[PDB]
Ligand binder design. Structure first.
Ligand SMILES: Nc1nc2c([nH]c(=O)n2[C@H]2C[C@H](O)[C@@H](COP(=O)(O)O)O2)c(=O)[nH]1
Ligand SMILES: OC[C@H]1O[C@@](CO)(O[C@H]2O[C@H](CO)[C@@H](O)[C@H](O)[C@H]2O)[C@@H](O)[C@@H]1O
Ligand SMILES: [Mn+2]
Ligand code: NA
Length: 129
């Protein structure tokens, strides 16, 4: 079974809103809401991966960020380790840089059912802030 390390960024603005994108219909976890992110490549660190992934996916450079949560999840056909970084400072303005839907969502209104099930404890913990 495939094993992956994934780095994602929880992009939070001053109004307690999070920048959320929607996954493609033909991707793993198709049509789900997501924190922007992707696979940590060989020769790069988890911190370097979340910077690169957010630059690629939404056109911002995160800075002075923190590890909010790290967890493992076994999907039906793959095992992933997710690194959730809390990003509250960045250069740039996030947008759908890869043509994907993106928008700001109030933290209090997030529905964990809209996200991959691996995100359940993270969305709960975010609402605890
Ligand atoms: N990008 C991203 N991927 C997630 C999240 N939650 C989650 O289980 N995943 C899974 C879906 C994919 O199997 C993998 C990410 O790989 P890609 O972003 O390259 O598709 O991690 C999330 O919040 N953001
Ligand atoms: O691991 C993140 C953690 O480390 C601190 C320093 O104690 O931040 C450092 O690492 C971040 C991720 O690379 C950088 O963004 C930051 O500039 C650097 O100081 C903590 O602030 C953070 O919780
Ligand atoms: Mn991705
Ligand atoms: Na990506």
């Amino acid at each position: 079974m495939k094993k992956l390390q994934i780095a994602v960024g929880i992009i939070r603005n001053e109004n307690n809103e999070i920048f959320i994108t929607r996954r493609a219909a033909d991707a793993h976890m198709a049509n789900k809401l997501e924190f922007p992110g992707g696979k940590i490549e060989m020769g790069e660190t988890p911190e370097q991966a979340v910077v690169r992934e957010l630059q690629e996916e939404v056109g911002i450079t995160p800075q002075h960020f923190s590890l909010f949560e790290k967890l493992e999840y076994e999907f039906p056909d793959r095992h992933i380790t997710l690194w959730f970084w809390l990003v509250e400072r960045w250069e740039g303005e996030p947008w759908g840089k890869e043509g994907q839907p993106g928008e700001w969502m109030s933290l209090v209104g997030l529905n964990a059912d809209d996200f991959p099930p691996a995100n359940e404890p993270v969305i709960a913990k975010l609402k605890r802030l």
